[model samples]
Every structure is written in structure tokens, then in C-alpha cells.
Target: GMILNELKAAIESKNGATRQELARRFALSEDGIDAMLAVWIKKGVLSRQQYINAEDEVVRVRYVMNQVGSLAVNVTM
Candidate 1:
């Protein structure tokens, strides 16, 4: 949709953006942003991922989103 395209332009122009920001501006959920981002994946450059910390033999989930390369924003038709 045109909204997604505009989101792309804004990201490209601003270098990058966060899911929260895009979600708010687009009036969508973070899942929506994540869904949009899923379209393009990079070589760990800007790819969002989760981690399990087991240093203490305990389960801990961690993740973070940030600015990055190659289509930093979500896109759609």
C-alpha cells in the first residue's frame, strides 16, 4: 500500500527507524511492523533476533531493534 511505501521513504531518508515508531505512525501494531520487516532480511546487519542466556543455567530471552542497512524499513505492495 502507499502507506508502506511512504514508510520506506521515511526510513531511507532518516537512515532508519524503530518498530514502535513506525507502528505508531502507521497506526499498526509492533507485530505489524515485524511482519512488514520480515519481507527483507539482511546478513545480520539489521536483522532483529532473540537470544537465550544460559550463563546461570537459567532461561532468559533478550532482543533489541535498531538502525541498519539494506531496506531498513518495512515494505509492501
Candidate 2:
């Protein structure tokens, strides 16, 4: 499994990636990113922001690293 640092960097490198994008980048299945994201949320390493899709008129969520997850910056230490 990739370390949190790798995940953090990857996510930050982009505006943000969807579950499918992350899975494809990491060569993992979409379900894998979904499962891992659940763990990160539970750990408070990530937080989600919801937006209402104008087209679908449904709420959608996006994940971003939180304070703890930002510790990935300490990777150089």
C-alpha cells in the first residue's frame, strides 16, 4: 500500500481527484479508493465538502486533506 504521504501528494498535486481518478492513478480499483477514503475520513485525515450538481441537482462530495493529513508535508523530515 502507498503511504499517506504519497496519497496526500497525489491529491494535492491536482485540484482534487475523484475516486475514479485516484484509483486509476494508483492502479487500484475504484472500490479501493472508496474504502481507503472511508478510513481517512474516520481518522480525520480527510474532510469532505459537498456541492450540489447543477446538472443532476444532487449533492456531490469531494475529499481533501485535513490538518492531520497535512503532516505529509513533514515527509522531508
Candidate 3:
């Protein structure tokens, strides 16, 4: 599945890609990737790490794996 591969590569790279990056890599629409990411977050397969900068208006977001996510991918092998 594209999600599986994209997610794997994202983690390996240790750099969070934007929704557009994910969409382009997976050949999916931006909204499609956004929706999938939301589902993954709700399913505990992904988490949003947020940091509020000195200027509160600016927030940084990063996607990370939770315990369940780690187990899911490792167990698949």
C-alpha cells in the first residue's frame, strides 16, 4: 500500500513531509492525504507533535509514531 511505503520512508527520513509531499508521492490528492492522516492519527497509528514558537501564532507540527503504530509495522514483518 502507498500509505505503508510512504509512512515507512517518512520515518526513516526522520523528516516530516507536508500533506502535499505525501499526496504527490502516493499519487493521491491533497485532501485524500490529509484525510488519511487524520484517520491514522485517530487510530493511534500516528500522532501530531506540536510546538508553539516564541510567537504563539506560529506552530510547528510533526508526525510521529505511537506505541501501537510501532507494533503494527514491526508485527507486519
Candidate 4:
């Protein structure tokens, strides 16, 4: 649970990040990162963008928060 919050904090501070960056930093499986990002995406707090090369291979994946969505939540401990 704390990891999830930390993940969000990292993303928020960076404004955007790649899955690999967060995965290695958090020492977590890519799948687990996916699940956490799923939560943010559904809550309208995060948006994802994927890029593909000419060979139809995904070259990049980045996540950023929605401007309006950022205003929706204020984390409180």
C-alpha cells in the first residue's frame, strides 16, 4: 500500500515516467507496475501514451497526470 503511494509520488514529482524507470526504482515486477498504473488511469489521475516504431514495435511508453485530474486529489497521511 505504501509502495503504491510512493509510486504515485515519484510519478507526480517527475510529471511523467516510463514503466522501466519506475520498475527498476521500486524493484517491482513490470506487471505489478501495470496494475498500479491501472488504478490511476481509471481514477482519471493518469494518462498513458504509447509510441511505435516503423516496424510496429512499441518503442516508448510514458505516463503523465491529467491537469484537471491532479486537482481532484490531495493526498493526506
Candidate 5:
């Protein structure tokens, strides 16, 4: 699907793209992007971590692509 490919590519290409940024880029609601992110996590590809986010107040949960994520992407590609 275009959405999946585009969003995954964005995660790979954007060094520090936040969930908000990804949602805006894909013209999707934050919650919508969130569900997709959860899929990636469930697949054992993407890993999410929570930060202090005291003053920043950015995305409460941060997502990162791990080795398995790269492997998954490679397979998709």
C-alpha cells in the first residue's frame, strides 16, 4: 500500500521525524499514524521509547527503527 510504503520510507529517510511530523507529511491524523506505528512495533521491527520530555513536551513516545526494522524494509523493497 502507498501509505505503508511512504510512511516506512519516511521513518527510514527522516533522521529525526517525529510522529507529528510524519502525520502531517502523510496528511493523516496523529492517531491514525499511531496505529500504524503500533503495527511496526508488534512486528518486532520498530521500537518505541518514552523520554522525560519535561520542558520539551514533544511526542510523549519516541519511535526508532531497529535492525529488524531495517531488515523488514529491505525485504519490502
Candidate 6:
């Protein structure tokens, strides 16, 4: 849908984006963002990285579009 496309475009423009930023931009909950991101990640179109705190905790998750994966989507579409 357009929502997913918009989310993808947002990440593509930035190369990478934080979960919170995407949630706010898309007016979605963090859980919602997680679900959407899972799809792309499974499809190999996205990769996720964690920002860990000194306490060994994850502070935030960053999602980035894979270069070849981006090309695959564009070419297929």
C-alpha cells in the first residue's frame, strides 16, 4: 500500500532511520513499525541495527535499505 511505500521512501532518502522517527512520521506505534519493518527485513530489502547502551541494552533500532535490495525492488516493480 501507499503507507508502506511512503515508509520505504522515507528510509531510502535517509539511507537509514530510527524506529521512533519512522513511527512519528508515519503516525504509527513502535509495534506497528516493527511489524512493517519485519516484512521488508524478511524480504531482504532492509537490514536492522541496534543502538546499544552502556548497560547492554538496546536504545533504538535503525533500519537501512540494502543497496542491492533496493535495486531489486525497483527493477521488479
Top of the candidates by TM-score: 6
How many clashing residue pairs, candidate 6? 0
lDDT of 5 by residue, 1-77 (tens): 45556655665575445567767877999777766765755653234533435657764545444223434334454
Query: lDDT of each prediction vs. the true structure?
Result: 0.54, 0.56, 0.56, 0.57, 0.56, 0.58
- Selected candidate, larger lDDT, 1 vs 5: 5
User: What is the per-residue lDDT of model 2 for residues 1-77, given as tens digits with 9 covering 90 to 100?
Assistant: 46345766765564565666667877878776666765765643334533436756664646444234434344565
> Which parts of model 3 have CA positions greater than 4 angstroms off?
4-9, 43-77
Best by lDDT: 6
Q: How many residue pairs clash in each candidate?
A: 0, 0, 0, 0, 0, 0
Residue pairs that clash (backbone atoms under 3 angstroms), model 1: none
lDDT of 1 by residue, 1-67 (tens): 5455665556546444566666777788888665655554332343355445577466574433333
Query: What tens digits encode model 3's per-residue C-alpha lDDT throughout 1-77?
Result: 45845574665556555565667878988776666666765643334443335656565554443223443344555
Report the Cα lDDT for residue 31, model 2. Answer: 73
Q: What's the distance in Å from true for residue 37, model 5? A: 2.2
Rate residue 31 of model 6 by lDDT.
70
**If both were scored by TM-score, which would come out higher, candidate 1 or candidate 3?**
3
Which stretches in model 5 have alpha-carbon errors above 4 Å? 41-63, 66-77
Off by over 4 Å in 1: 40-77
